[PDB]
Write a protein that binds this ligand. Sequence first.
Ligand SMILES: [Mg+2]
Ligand SMILES: [Mg+2]
Ligand SMILES: [Mg+2]
Ligand SMILES: [Mg+2]
Ligand SMILES: [Mg+2]
Ligand SMILES: [Mg+2]
Ligand SMILES: [Mg+2]
Ligand SMILES: [Mg+2]
Ligand SMILES: [Mg+2]
Ligand SMILES: [Mg+2]
Ligand SMILES: [Mg+2]
Ligand SMILES: [Mg+2]
Ligand SMILES: [Mg+2]
Ligand SMILES: [Mg+2]
Ligand SMILES: [Mg+2]
Ligand SMILES: [Mg+2]
Ligand SMILES: [Mg+2]
Ligand SMILES: [Mg+2]
Ligand SMILES: [Mg+2]
Ligand SMILES: [Mg+2]
Ligand SMILES: [Mg+2]
Ligand SMILES: [Mg+2]
Ligand SMILES: [Mg+2]
Ligand SMILES: [Mg+2]
Ligand SMILES: [Mg+2]
Ligand SMILES: [Mg+2]
Ligand SMILES: [Mg+2]
Ligand SMILES: [Mg+2]
Ligand SMILES: [Mg+2]
Lengths: 187, 149, 147, 128, 52, 124, 53
Amino acid sequence: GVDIRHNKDRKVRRKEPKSQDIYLRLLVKLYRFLARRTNSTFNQVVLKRLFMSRTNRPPLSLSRMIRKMKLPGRENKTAVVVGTVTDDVRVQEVPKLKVCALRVTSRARSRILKAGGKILTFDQLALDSPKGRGTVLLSGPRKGREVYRHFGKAPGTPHSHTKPYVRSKGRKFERARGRRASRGYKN
Amino acid sequence: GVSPKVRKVLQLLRLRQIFNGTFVKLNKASINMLRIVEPYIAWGYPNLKSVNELIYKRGYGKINKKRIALTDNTLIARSLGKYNIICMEDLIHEIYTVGKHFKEANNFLWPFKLSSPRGGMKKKTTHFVEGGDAGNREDQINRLIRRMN
Amino acid sequence: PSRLRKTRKLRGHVSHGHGRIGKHRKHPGGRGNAGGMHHHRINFDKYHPGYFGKVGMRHYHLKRNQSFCPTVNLDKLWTLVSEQTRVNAAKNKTGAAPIIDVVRSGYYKVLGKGKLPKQPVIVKAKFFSRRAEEKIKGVGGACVLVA
Amino acid sequence: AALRPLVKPKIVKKRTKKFIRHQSDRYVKIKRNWRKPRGIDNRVRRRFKGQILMPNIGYGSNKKTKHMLPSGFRKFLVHNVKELEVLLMCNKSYCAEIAHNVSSKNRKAIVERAAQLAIRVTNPNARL
Amino acid sequence: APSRNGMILKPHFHKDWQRRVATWFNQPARKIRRRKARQARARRIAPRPAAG
Amino acid sequence: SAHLQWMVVRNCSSFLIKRNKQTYSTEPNNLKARNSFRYNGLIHRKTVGVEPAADGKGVVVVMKRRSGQRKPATSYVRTTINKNARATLSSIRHMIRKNKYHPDLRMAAIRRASAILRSQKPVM
Amino acid sequence: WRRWHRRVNTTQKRYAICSALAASALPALVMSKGHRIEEVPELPLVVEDKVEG
RNA sequence: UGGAUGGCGCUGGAGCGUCGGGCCCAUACCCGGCCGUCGCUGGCAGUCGGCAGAGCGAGAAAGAGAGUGGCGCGGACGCUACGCCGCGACGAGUAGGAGGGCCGCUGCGGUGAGCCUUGAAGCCUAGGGCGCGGGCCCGGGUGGAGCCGC
RNA sequence: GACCCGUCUUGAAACACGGACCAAGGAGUCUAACACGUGCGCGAGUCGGGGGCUACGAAAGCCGCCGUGGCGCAAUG
RNA sequence: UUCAAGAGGGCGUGAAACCGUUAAGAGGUAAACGGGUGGGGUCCGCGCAGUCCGCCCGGAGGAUUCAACCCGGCGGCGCGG
Ligand SMILES: [Mg+2]
Ligand SMILES: [Mg+2]
Ligand SMILES: [Mg+2]
Ligand SMILES: [Mg+2]
Ligand SMILES: [Mg+2]
Ligand SMILES: [Mg+2]
Ligand SMILES: [Mg+2]
Ligand SMILES: [Mg+2]
Ligand SMILES: [Mg+2]
Ligand SMILES: [Mg+2]
Ligand SMILES: [Mg+2]
Ligand SMILES: [Mg+2]
Ligand SMILES: [Mg+2]
Ligand SMILES: [Mg+2]
Ligand SMILES: [Mg+2]
Ligand SMILES: [Mg+2]
Ligand SMILES: [Mg+2]
Ligand SMILES: [Mg+2]
Ligand SMILES: [Mg+2]
Ligand SMILES: [Mg+2]
Ligand SMILES: [Mg+2]
Ligand SMILES: [Mg+2]
Ligand SMILES: [Mg+2]
Ligand SMILES: [Mg+2]
Ligand SMILES: [Mg+2]
Ligand SMILES: [Mg+2]
Ligand SMILES: [Mg+2]
Ligand SMILES: [Mg+2]
Ligand SMILES: [Mg+2]
């Protein structure tokens, strides 16, 4: 008899992916290997990010890669994004790159090869650099979805900016009582 | 049936089961803590022998949140090499005469697992003064380690 | 997928996942949105503020075509005309300027949001905005209206 | 005087009887199959003294002597001759048990073939 | 009986709707009817324009 | 390739069998017959198969070359050994060793053929 | 009026066709499916145009 | 209603008060075996073989480090990576929640060169056994035409 | 050693209720909408659901000067 | 008569409650169960002189009999610096 509460003995983190594809499980079979065997933590980070879902490995646009690569010091340096890379049209001057991502869209792949860039895969990242040296690692915006504008403190509650669920915004959908100052109250 | 302020103490000395024993160094800041649980303990002041017959026999380690026994000096010299404690007889000189490095050899010792006392206690509840087993008993605790150990 | 549900795993339990003291009866709290002002008051005062009341002017035979006005920014104003016209325009030394039509591409009004690269333009539109006009006057180029 | 198993371990088991449903003998419409009783007055679920025991997991068996016949062989279920070429390499551990619907003109040619390969058959004199 | 946070909504089913329900299982056997009554119309007028 | 179709074949083939908490496999060039990555014979470039002679006596050995992989007609090669007990096992230890041809399958490709020689004996 | 039918996207219908044509060329995914292909001389088997006659 | 230190019965007590020694037993505590979950995000793609030579568990951050003038034809098991192996602590549980079910019924695409009037389903059984269990499998009888596994 | 099971109940062996006995049948299903997790494709764009063209097949395949249109890219009064 | 009345004019299959008779084993605290042995029966062992496989020495037997060369065919590695 021992008064240990067994409430949080089981961790609720994720071990292995729920995905049934085989072009992900053949790369997980190579970094399950390179995570227990080598010392460096680049493998132990990319392994953890090959398990998470789609809505937790968000797409990195290309001008956060020109921004996060123009910073002084990071010259001649390849990028690693576990997510995806989509093209942008509100950029007129693209430099040369060296990208290591999963899925590159067919407007930006052709945007970089015209500018003399280079796109690798996660097996040629293994042939090129196993222990994780000379790689700048990125990620996309996590809290960028529109859902995260519904959350938090409930509205009708002072000092709280939060969008409620409305079937259609207009001139008589939720404008009247708790919002004006003459119809009751405001908050 | 335990008082909540008590059970916090008995989980600040790491005494979770019944019949668990530890070594506590003394000061004013830990007598008044060991006063509030006088009905649940029976503490004393041990002799030199009953430290040997607790380290050599019921003495298990604590290596990486596990419970690994003591069959060599190199099991001590991994986790205590930064204190010039490289064997068992230095850990005993530390406990008997309480050296500077007492905390790093008492958080390391897993709580002991004693057995049931042979023969029988007098009566569990009351104080040792009026013929019980609780409370202070300054050098009769080696008559309860030679019985239980 | 009847086989993946919950009630197929509850055959054997008596209450079927809805209690025994207060059973799953038919309609405890009225049908639908009953009690906006009496006894479900807190849910609407905490999650739908301003559900109750009227405001403003009425407008009877309202069409959605007199107020049709899609917009655009100055960021992607170059996306309408293909790439090789912006090139020849940045390449020629003469001082000509490529004409950008918006009405043809399904836009009317020109707003102004972002940075704009420095080469002369001519914009045919139906309206403008004051920032989005002083960015083109500041780069060089005009702003031409059309009915 | 038989086909000896490779190694013959001492089979120990933790319970040799069955489990019967609570109040099975008073009625006939109660079968002798197990159904976990879910009352609130009850005595079995709350483990009184001297009642019918319940099937926890502690009665599980050791992974080394699981599914083992008393002769020391495991079982395998065979229809035709073509599946006995499976067992010519795994021989001294598993045994074959011929199905029911196989008629008695084929078991004459299965058991003979399963005497060359030195494979034990549990029911060799089935029909005759 | 609304819970914590869901959108308000008004379904239009208080009427009896199961009586007037228009199924569409006709559809792949009416595109063939219109295809025949259009090609037999396209062969009645042999050199005329088919599209009006 | 190889690891692609093991991730495909490992559970929905037709040479596969599942009963009595077990697993077997009926490939035409398998030995130990069990579903694993190393004892499958349809995937690799190099495969060892040991079969009984089509006649009453002897042991055939089905190899596989590397040149014509997608041509199932002349991809394999069959030889036939009808000799005594020692030199047959030596000429299989030599076929698998001294060519460096898939050396993992040596002891099991000797055990299975010493069970064919045990098998084709006149029974008492 | 139970919802009988389903619809699937276009560019998944075409990805399944490309992923079913790419596995009618290996002589292992055909044998394991169950056919009898021990002797056929070439797996993308292309024959002349006089079979339509 | 005929009845209660629990009963029979108990006065150098089997009664009252203070206290000694010795002894009995619970699923509690110790030690040992077994199952299972949690945990170390613990360990294995180095089965690298006559082109070889058999490796890192050791108290002290870092290479049995590379370049440098100083006779015989021989060697177990394994690894369905959704796998296998090792070390620790723990396990009560209604309403209620979740996960695994090689448990089960009726039906469809696939597949077993499946079985079947030399006897299928279904019943019966003091016949033989496996599984924690849901349940299944076999032998022996009746029965007479369609059935099952993945 | 051991009171008879289901059930409301703070409290069932109850002087609380339903139950003589066996076989078969028997109770959270079906649409529309919305919210969140999760798997898949394309990606600043996406979607042909309605319409056309060429035994299984009432299926499948196409059309881009058939992308009108829906949601999204820009809010506020 | 028919392969079959163990298919007999509401006739395929023939379930349980239930009753009849036979054989066995019992019986004064209503019967029934759980944990534990013991006795008695039915049955299986197709039990009733109890392992086998390697390798050497020894004893007796016999083949169509080895190592090596010689031609013929196939296959594999080739860093041919
Ligand atoms: Mg315990
Ligand atoms: Mg608990
Ligand atoms: Mg004693
Ligand atoms: Mg429950
Ligand atoms: Mg529920
Ligand atoms: Mg109820
Ligand atoms: Mg109530
Ligand atoms: Mg409800
Ligand atoms: Mg209760
Ligand atoms: Mg509710
Ligand atoms: Mg005990
Ligand atoms: Mg123990
Ligand atoms: Mg529990
Ligand atoms: Mg019976
Ligand atoms: Mg018939
Ligand atoms: Mg009693
Ligand atoms: Mg009631
Ligand atoms: Mg009530
Ligand atoms: Mg009451
Ligand atoms: Mg209650
Ligand atoms: Mg009750
Ligand atoms: Mg009532
Ligand atoms: Mg009644
Ligand atoms: Mg039923
Ligand atoms: Mg989603
Ligand atoms: Mg008959
Ligand atoms: Mg009849
Ligand atoms: Mg009778
Ligand atoms: Mg009798």
